[PDB]
């Protein structure tokens, strides 16, 4: 009962109209060409009709009436393509949630999957439980694989919410869309069973707070140089400070010297002009909250962060519980420091932005995440 | 559970078994081998 | 000065690097430099290189060898045709480290076995043979420079003799493999010569 | 749930006279006790600029509803620049008619009191100093939850909170030393030392304790009806010039 | 009546499903490797001798003539992978030896 | 400052010839724990930090690649480094290798150098696995192909056949031919990685 692409579901036409109105004209032309090449309905004779239509500069409404009333829902595969192109177009609408892939002792396992044989295995594992249809494509810019898993029910077939699972190419961290119903656990457990094929893999989730876009979660926790530094160590993730040993020595930071400012270490902040010193103070704040040199937003916007500082004075465990909120936390913190409200001499590393989107405690001066 | 009981039975019959000179000095053991093996490329 | 101290003392001990000269043409740069691997003070071997930068759009075009101290020259003859000098420098340094560790292990074993029974070295230093009563034990330690991983990998095998003939090799290889796996290198060899003694147990 | 709004009073006045005019305008009877209270009754005050005259104008009515129940706690001193103020709760119309009578009869100037940051810090310091009958100040503790609400570009950082549990607060207080001011000598230097966030300059909104009080920038929400002496002493000290 | 008929036939079907699942195992699944069941289901499209070696040592041992033939073939394949490992290590040794010889001659 | 300029230039070119090795230990200090001792106004470092600069040198383009950095910070109560902020991508497992070296605890400098050398061998293996396929492309023996980020799974084209390779550490384990001679051609190309370059001319001649 694994549904093929030629099956058509029963959905409302106006919501597909509303979805397909959120796309440009050339992707609609590509979609019409691919659907007529694969399925058709009502060769190259009908192609010049749309070639002449897009040359005249028509609106999107007449061409979306064309696509919705030469096929009259279209099918399950066409809906999957529409929704996946909508995911490619506007990435700010979704919400990802990462999860690691452990095996055996606890060593991480790179997935290294192939898009061909994985799809039929996932479908023949899921079809023994529910009605299902999967669809897997490659992101055109970022090197990830986005898999759209859709499920159905019988009161003909009432659709469910489509569930996304994003595989990066060479990382043991697998993103899935944020859900907590029994279908989400079923799909994630089925993928954890069918991706292995030699030795068993489990999916311990590494985070509990969702993050917004796929570029952000890819830069945070995918295969990238920014995967761990992420904060004041952002200079080491781009290497803009050193050159190769085969470079010139005349243009070297050892020979040229960088303009620096003498720090203050006495308590000279609670007792409160020269625009070069003002520019150096803004450069110091830019160094501490970011890399070397809009204008407040960081590399990645982080939604929610909750810290915990468990210090120890005279054998007393003194806990505090910082919590944050908003659109971009560390950018707003850099803005608040830029207005001379936070003494940047005493801002620790975990507050500064490193180990971003990780809400964990601190036990004697070294960060550790929370389960 | 069968592997757990078989491991316990094997440990008890090895405790009766005779390994006096070459084994009983460790029965710091496998960690220095892995250290010197990934050092000397053994 | 502190960065050169961290580069010289802490991360490459007993290595004598000294730059010699440099020159530019109109946009390339030449550099002659020598290394003196001085971990073995009894016979330290040296080498001399000559590199040609592009010096902007940073590229290595020409690099070659000026002179080698004739102690590893035949062994380096296979490795110095790969045209990848990073493998050459790291392989020479790892060879010096491995040879110093090997001669330290053999000096430890001879200083602990020179009392009870006899001992003598072999071909260059690659194998060590002890004898008793007769019964002989041969331990092999071969350092193989790479050619056609790239670090110089070592090989350890042992062999016994009961006076009449050599023993079987499969059981001795399994025993020495398990004993090195379980005890180590500096401790496993002491255990294997103690079990080839076998006076009591 | 008794939200205490705060208003100012321009001129020093007595309240024993003219109250019968309020009774005639109101057709009710109210009791106005004259408590000549004094802050830190411990003798390290000099008995000068430490006493106040409190006029708890209660409304002894049927207590079936709390939103119509409204006290009027007053304070005064004949030595400072601005001598008096009041604070009212409830949602009655009697608050409006009595502020009408106070504006009409004595001829004074009323205005709402907005709070500073160090004023909120001193109020959180004073709202936990409990007075017992044995002439000493025992200090309870509460798991305080501070709050902030700054405004940044594109609403980057909307609101963020610092929560300190009770045992940690007691540990910081016992580790600082013996003093009557924990929240201005121990915790705020600790937050500045371990975070760098000076809470005197950051925009405070709601210093909230563990269900006991809720200090805001425009009002004070409590759980019991009464308000302590040091709280009104700190408030009256704050509005001076 | 049809519901009771179905319930009686399901109660009869339960004993049949328990008996036909508790038959002779005939070396069943979840006991071999990936490559053994992939060669069972046909067209694996990816051969890999290392996984065949690591999975052929995982199969158990056991019309007794075909059982003897299976155990003989199992011993034969065990000897195959044994000789494969021996020949690989010996070929590496021979290649190192002739590399030293080529270095000397050059 | 002319003689000191020439001395600093010699120091910089010495740093360059040491950095051409690949594994260097540059000093570092975390700017938050620069505590003042208040005995003379001087500044001592509370928690020491030691930065490893891994740098793989290519051969095809004959230039140094982007160097990966590993940073180690000493713990406050154990006198052992723990891996603070590394920049290696996550297909090369770093935390498990740091737990595996010397039983988890790393004390001396050469104990860290062993971990740096292991990660260096992994990086150079990945780099050579990418380079050999890129030069097989540049020699035009193969058609257009796709590479992974670690060059462990590639798929190229020959004149008729689509070929998939899944390669382990510098030797090929799983192959795939897709489009009884196919099985012989499948097992024939299995082996080393330069053996693939030799055996591709054995079937495309």
GROMACS .gro file of N, CA and C in nm, chain A residues 200-310:
model
  333
  200UNK      N    1   2.346  -0.112   1.449
  200UNK     CA    2   2.231  -0.030   1.486
  200UNK      C    3   2.272   0.110   1.529
  201UNK      N    4   2.190   0.208   1.491
  201UNK     CA    5   2.212   0.349   1.521
  201UNK      C    6   2.094   0.398   1.603
  202UNK      N    7   2.122   0.482   1.703
  202UNK     CA    8   2.017   0.548   1.779
  202UNK      C    9   2.032   0.698   1.762
  203UNK      N   10   1.925   0.770   1.790
  203UNK     CA   11   1.919   0.915   1.769
  203UNK      C   12   1.897   0.985   1.903
  204UNK      N   13   2.004   1.013   1.971
  204UNK     CA   14   1.987   1.095   2.090
  204UNK      C   15   1.977   1.241   2.050
  205UNK      N   16   1.873   1.313   2.093
  205UNK     CA   17   1.862   1.454   2.056
  205UNK      C   18   1.962   1.539   2.133
  206UNK      N   19   2.027   1.630   2.060
  206UNK     CA   20   2.132   1.713   2.117
  206UNK      C   21   2.078   1.847   2.166
  207UNK      N   22   1.957   1.885   2.125
  207UNK     CA   23   1.902   2.013   2.164
  207UNK      C   24   1.753   1.999   2.186
  208UNK      N   25   1.697   2.092   2.263
  208UNK     CA   26   1.555   2.094   2.291
  208UNK      C   27   1.485   2.218   2.240
  209UNK      N   28   1.560   2.325   2.213
  209UNK     CA   29   1.505   2.452   2.167
  209UNK      C   30   1.519   2.456   2.016
  210UNK      N   31   1.412   2.483   1.942
  210UNK     CA   32   1.423   2.486   1.796
  210UNK      C   33   1.494   2.611   1.747
  211UNK      N   34   1.545   2.603   1.626
  211UNK     CA   35   1.614   2.714   1.561
  211UNK      C   36   1.548   2.733   1.425
  212UNK      N   37   1.566   2.852   1.366
  212UNK     CA   38   1.474   2.896   1.262
  212UNK      C   39   1.503   2.841   1.123
  213UNK      N   40   1.615   2.879   1.063
  213UNK     CA   41   1.635   2.854   0.921
  213UNK      C   42   1.725   2.733   0.900
  214UNK      N   43   1.742   2.690   0.775
  214UNK     CA   44   1.834   2.582   0.745
  214UNK      C   45   1.977   2.630   0.723
  215UNK      N   46   1.997   2.755   0.678
  215UNK     CA   47   2.132   2.810   0.673
  215UNK      C   48   2.188   2.828   0.813
  216UNK      N   49   2.104   2.867   0.907
  216UNK     CA   50   2.149   2.890   1.044
  216UNK      C   51   2.185   2.759   1.112
  217UNK      N   52   2.101   2.656   1.098
  217UNK     CA   53   2.132   2.529   1.162
  217UNK      C   54   2.246   2.459   1.089
  218UNK      N   55   2.265   2.486   0.959
  218UNK     CA   56   2.379   2.430   0.889
  218UNK      C   57   2.509   2.495   0.933
  219UNK      N   58   2.509   2.627   0.952
  219UNK     CA   59   2.628   2.695   0.999
  219UNK      C   60   2.656   2.662   1.145
  220UNK      N   61   2.552   2.635   1.223
  220UNK     CA   62   2.571   2.603   1.363
  220UNK      C   63   2.624   2.461   1.382
  221UNK      N   64   2.548   2.362   1.336
  221UNK     CA   65   2.575   2.224   1.375
  221UNK      C   66   2.599   2.127   1.261
  222UNK      N   67   2.618   2.175   1.138
  222UNK     CA   68   2.648   2.086   1.030
  222UNK      C   69   2.798   2.065   1.015
  223UNK      N   70   2.839   2.015   0.899
  223UNK     CA   71   2.983   2.010   0.870
  223UNK      C   72   3.033   2.146   0.826
  224UNK      N   73   3.101   2.217   0.916
  224UNK     CA   74   3.145   2.352   0.887
  224UNK      C   75   3.257   2.389   0.983
  225UNK      N   76   3.335   2.489   0.944
  225UNK     CA   77   3.440   2.538   1.031
  225UNK      C   78   3.384   2.618   1.148
  226UNK      N   79   3.264   2.675   1.133
  226UNK     CA   80   3.200   2.751   1.239
  226UNK      C   81   3.126   2.662   1.338
  227UNK      N   82   3.147   2.531   1.334
  227UNK     CA   83   3.062   2.439   1.408
  227UNK      C   84   3.086   2.443   1.558
  228UNK      N   85   3.202   2.490   1.603
  228UNK     CA   86   3.228   2.489   1.746
  228UNK      C   87   3.276   2.624   1.797
  229UNK      N   88   3.338   2.705   1.711
  229UNK     CA   89   3.397   2.830   1.759
  229UNK      C   90   3.289   2.935   1.784
  230UNK      N   91   3.225   2.984   1.678
  230UNK     CA   92   3.092   3.045   1.679
  230UNK      C   93   3.082   3.180   1.753
  231UNK      N   94   3.187   3.221   1.824
  231UNK     CA   95   3.176   3.336   1.911
  231UNK      C   96   3.290   3.433   1.893
  232UNK      N   97   3.362   3.463   2.002
  232UNK     CA   98   3.487   3.539   1.989
  232UNK      C   99   3.597   3.461   1.920
  233UNK      N  100   3.584   3.329   1.909
  233UNK     CA  101   3.676   3.247   1.831
  233UNK      C  102   3.637   3.238   1.684
  234UNK      N  103   3.553   3.329   1.635
  234UNK     CA  104   3.512   3.328   1.495
  234UNK      C  105   3.626   3.361   1.400
  235UNK      N  106   3.733   3.424   1.448
  235UNK     CA  107   3.850   3.448   1.366
  235UNK      C  108   3.920   3.320   1.324
  236UNK      N  109   3.925   3.219   1.411
  236UNK     CA  110   3.988   3.092   1.375
  236UNK      C  111   3.905   3.011   1.278
  237UNK      N  112   3.777   3.042   1.263
  237UNK     CA  113   3.693   2.974   1.166
  237UNK      C  114   3.697   3.038   1.029
  238UNK      N  115   3.775   3.144   1.011
  238UNK     CA  116   3.791   3.204   0.880
  238UNK      C  117   3.935   3.237   0.845
  239UNK      N  118   4.025   3.239   0.943
  239UNK     CA  119   4.171   3.250   0.925
  239UNK      C  120   4.210   3.378   0.852
  240UNK      N  121   4.143   3.487   0.888
  240UNK     CA  122   4.173   3.616   0.826
  240UNK      C  123   4.288   3.688   0.893
  241UNK      N  124   4.351   3.627   0.993
  241UNK     CA  125   4.457   3.690   1.069
  241UNK      C  126   4.596   3.645   1.028
  242UNK      N  127   4.611   3.523   0.978
  242UNK     CA  128   4.739   3.471   0.931
  242UNK      C  129   4.731   3.441   0.782
  243UNK      N  130   4.846   3.442   0.717
  243UNK     CA  131   4.857   3.398   0.580
  243UNK      C  132   4.934   3.267   0.576
  244UNK      N  133   4.953   3.213   0.456
  244UNK     CA  134   5.031   3.092   0.440
  244UNK      C  135   5.179   3.121   0.466
  245UNK      N  136   5.259   3.019   0.498
  245UNK     CA  137   5.404   3.041   0.511
  245UNK      C  138   5.472   3.081   0.381
  246UNK      N  139   5.411   3.055   0.266
  246UNK     CA  140   5.464   3.099   0.139
  246UNK      C  141   5.425   3.242   0.104
  247UNK      N  142   5.370   3.318   0.198
  247UNK     CA  143   5.332   3.455   0.170
  247UNK      C  144   5.450   3.549   0.197
  248UNK      N  145   5.427   3.677   0.173
  248UNK     CA  146   5.527   3.778   0.203
  248UNK      C  147   5.543   3.794   0.353
  249UNK      N  148   5.663   3.835   0.395
  249UNK     CA  149   5.686   3.873   0.533
  249UNK      C  150   5.675   4.023   0.556
  250UNK      N  151   5.678   4.103   0.449
  250UNK     CA  152   5.665   4.247   0.464
  250UNK      C  153   5.523   4.286   0.504
  251UNK      N  154   5.423   4.217   0.451
  251UNK     CA  155   5.285   4.236   0.493
  251UNK      C  156   5.252   4.125   0.592
  252UNK      N  157   5.306   4.138   0.712
  252UNK     CA  158   5.282   4.044   0.821
  252UNK      C  159   5.249   4.121   0.948
  253UNK      N  160   5.163   4.061   1.030
  253UNK     CA  161   5.119   4.129   1.152
  253UNK      C  162   5.230   4.138   1.255
  254UNK      N  163   5.328   4.049   1.248
  254UNK     CA  164   5.447   4.067   1.328
  254UNK      C  165   5.532   4.185   1.288
  255UNK      N  166   5.533   4.221   1.160
  255UNK     CA  167   5.613   4.333   1.112
  255UNK      C  168   5.537   4.464   1.109
  256UNK      N  169   5.408   4.462   1.075
  256UNK     CA  170   5.331   4.585   1.066
  256UNK      C  171   5.280   4.633   1.200
  257UNK      N  172   5.232   4.543   1.285
  257UNK     CA  173   5.179   4.581   1.414
  257UNK      C  174   5.037   4.633   1.405
  258UNK      N  175   4.955   4.591   1.501
  258UNK     CA  176   4.815   4.629   1.504
  258UNK      C  177   4.794   4.733   1.613
  259UNK      N  178   4.707   4.829   1.584
  259UNK     CA  179   4.675   4.937   1.676
  259UNK      C  180   4.588   4.882   1.788
  260UNK      N  181   4.636   4.892   1.911
  260UNK     CA  182   4.569   4.835   2.027
  260UNK      C  183   4.540   4.944   2.129
  261UNK      N  184   4.458   4.909   2.228
  261UNK     CA  185   4.418   5.001   2.334
  261UNK      C  186   4.453   4.939   2.469
  262UNK      N  187   4.507   5.020   2.560
  262UNK     CA  188   4.546   4.972   2.691
  262UNK      C  189   4.421   4.942   2.773
  263UNK      N  190   4.408   4.818   2.818
  263UNK     CA  191   4.293   4.779   2.899
  263UNK      C  192   4.305   4.836   3.039
  264UNK      N  193   4.190   4.843   3.107
  264UNK     CA  194   4.184   4.885   3.246
  264UNK      C  195   4.142   4.765   3.330
  265UNK      N  196   4.208   4.747   3.445
  265UNK     CA  197   4.184   4.631   3.529
  265UNK      C  198   4.136   4.667   3.669
  266UNK      N  199   4.149   4.793   3.711
  266UNK     CA  200   4.085   4.837   3.833
  266UNK      C  201   3.937   4.860   3.807
  267UNK      N  202   3.859   4.868   3.914
  267UNK     CA  203   3.715   4.888   3.901
  267UNK      C  204   3.684   5.032   3.863
  268UNK      N  205   3.706   5.067   3.736
  268UNK     CA  206   3.688   5.203   3.687
  268UNK      C  207   3.575   5.208   3.585
  269UNK      N  208   3.467   5.137   3.613
  269UNK     CA  209   3.351   5.139   3.525
  269UNK      C  210   3.229   5.201   3.591
  270UNK      N  211   3.218   5.191   3.723
  270UNK     CA  212   3.099   5.237   3.794
  270UNK      C  213   3.103   5.386   3.827
  271UNK      N  214   3.191   5.463   3.763
  271UNK     CA  215   3.201   5.607   3.786
  271UNK      C  216   3.192   5.675   3.650
  272UNK      N  217   3.069   5.702   3.606
  272UNK     CA  218   3.047   5.762   3.475
  272UNK      C  219   2.921   5.848   3.474
  273UNK      N  220   3.345   6.256   2.249
  273UNK     CA  221   3.469   6.275   2.322
  273UNK      C  222   3.576   6.177   2.276
  274UNK      N  223   3.682   6.231   2.214
  274UNK     CA  224   3.800   6.159   2.165
  274UNK      C  225   3.760   6.052   2.064
  275UNK      N  226   3.724   6.090   1.941
  275UNK     CA  227   3.662   5.995   1.846
  275UNK      C  228   3.753   5.881   1.800
  276UNK      N  229   3.885   5.895   1.809
  276UNK     CA  230   3.972   5.781   1.783
  276UNK      C  231   3.958   5.676   1.893
  277UNK      N  232   3.949   5.720   2.019
  277UNK     CA  233   3.927   5.627   2.129
  277UNK      C  234   3.786   5.569   2.122
  278UNK      N  235   3.690   5.646   2.072
  278UNK     CA  236   3.555   5.593   2.054
  278UNK      C  237   3.552   5.486   1.945
  279UNK      N  238   3.625   5.509   1.836
  279UNK     CA  239   3.635   5.408   1.730
  279UNK      C  240   3.707   5.284   1.780
  280UNK      N  241   3.809   5.301   1.864
  280UNK     CA  242   3.877   5.185   1.920
  280UNK      C  243   3.790   5.110   2.020
  281UNK      N  244   3.703   5.181   2.092
  281UNK     CA  245   3.610   5.113   2.183
  281UNK      C  246   3.506   5.033   2.106
  282UNK      N  247   3.456   5.089   1.995
  282UNK     CA  248   3.364   5.014   1.911
  282UNK      C  249   3.433   4.896   1.844
  283UNK      N  250   3.561   4.912   1.809
  283UNK     CA  251   3.638   4.800   1.756
  283UNK      C  252   3.660   4.692   1.862
  284UNK      N  253   3.679   4.733   1.988
  284UNK     CA  254   3.693   4.636   2.097
  284UNK      C  255   3.565   4.558   2.118
  285UNK      N  256   3.450   4.625   2.112
  285UNK     CA  257   3.322   4.556   2.124
  285UNK      C  258   3.298   4.463   2.006
  286UNK      N  259   3.339   4.506   1.886
  286UNK     CA  260   3.328   4.421   1.768
  286UNK      C  261   3.418   4.298   1.779
  287UNK      N  262   3.536   4.314   1.839
  287UNK     CA  263   3.626   4.200   1.863
  287UNK      C  264   3.564   4.103   1.963
  288UNK      N  265   3.509   4.155   2.073
  288UNK     CA  266   3.462   4.065   2.178
  288UNK      C  267   3.335   3.993   2.138
  289UNK      N  268   3.243   4.058   2.068
  289UNK     CA  269   3.116   3.994   2.038
  289UNK      C  270   3.113   3.926   1.901
  290UNK      N  271   3.216   3.945   1.819
  290UNK     CA  272   3.219   3.893   1.683
  290UNK      C  273   3.362   3.861   1.642
  291UNK      N  274   3.390   3.859   1.513
  291UNK     CA  275   3.524   3.827   1.469
  291UNK      C  276   3.614   3.948   1.471
  292UNK      N  277   3.665   3.991   1.355
  292UNK     CA  278   3.759   4.102   1.350
  292UNK      C  279   3.694   4.238   1.328
  293UNK      N  280   3.622   4.259   1.219
  293UNK     CA  281   3.560   4.387   1.189
  293UNK      C  282   3.436   4.368   1.103
  294UNK      N  283   2.147   4.567   0.989
  294UNK     CA  284   2.283   4.514   0.984
  294UNK      C  285   2.370   4.577   1.092
  295UNK      N  286   2.498   4.538   1.090
  295UNK     CA  287   2.611   4.592   1.168
  295UNK      C  288   2.606   4.554   1.316
  296UNK      N  289   2.493   4.501   1.363
  296UNK     CA  290   2.481   4.444   1.496
  296UNK      C  291   2.444   4.298   1.496
  297UNK      N  292   2.373   4.250   1.394
  297UNK     CA  293   2.330   4.112   1.388
  297UNK      C  294   2.450   4.021   1.367
  298UNK      N  295   2.451   3.908   1.437
  298UNK     CA  296   2.565   3.817   1.431
  298UNK      C  297   2.561   3.734   1.304
  299UNK      N  298   2.647   3.633   1.299
  299UNK     CA  299   2.644   3.539   1.188
  299UNK      C  300   2.517   3.457   1.189
  300UNK      N  301   2.478   3.407   1.306
  300UNK     CA  302   2.360   3.323   1.322
  300UNK      C  303   2.266   3.390   1.422
  301UNK      N  304   2.138   3.408   1.390
  301UNK     CA  305   2.043   3.453   1.492
  301UNK      C  306   1.994   3.339   1.580
  302UNK      N  307   2.009   3.357   1.711
  302UNK     CA  308   1.970   3.258   1.810
  302UNK      C  309   1.843   3.307   1.878
  303UNK      N  310   1.742   3.221   1.888
  303UNK     CA  311   1.614   3.262   1.947
  303UNK      C  312   1.617   3.264   2.099
  304UNK      N  313   1.642   3.149   2.162
  304UNK     CA  314   1.626   3.135   2.305
  304UNK      C  315   1.748   3.067   2.365
  305UNK      N  316   1.795   3.120   2.477
  305UNK     CA  317   1.913   3.069   2.546
  305UNK      C  318   1.887   3.078   2.696
  306UNK      N  319   1.909   2.968   2.768
  306UNK     CA  320   1.903   2.972   2.912
  306UNK      C  321   2.029   2.921   2.979
  307UNK      N  322   2.102   3.009   3.047
  307UNK     CA  323   2.226   2.971   3.110
  307UNK      C  324   2.203   2.933   3.256
  308UNK      N  325   2.312   2.894   3.324
  308UNK     CA  326   2.312   2.864   3.467
  308UNK      C  327   2.457   2.871   3.512
  309UNK      N  328   2.485   2.956   3.610
  309UNK     CA  329   2.622   2.975   3.658
  309UNK      C  330   2.632   2.922   3.801
  310UNK      N  331   2.693   2.805   3.816
  310UNK     CA  332   2.710   2.742   3.947
  310UNK      C  333   2.854   2.762   3.991
   0.00000   0.00000   0.00000
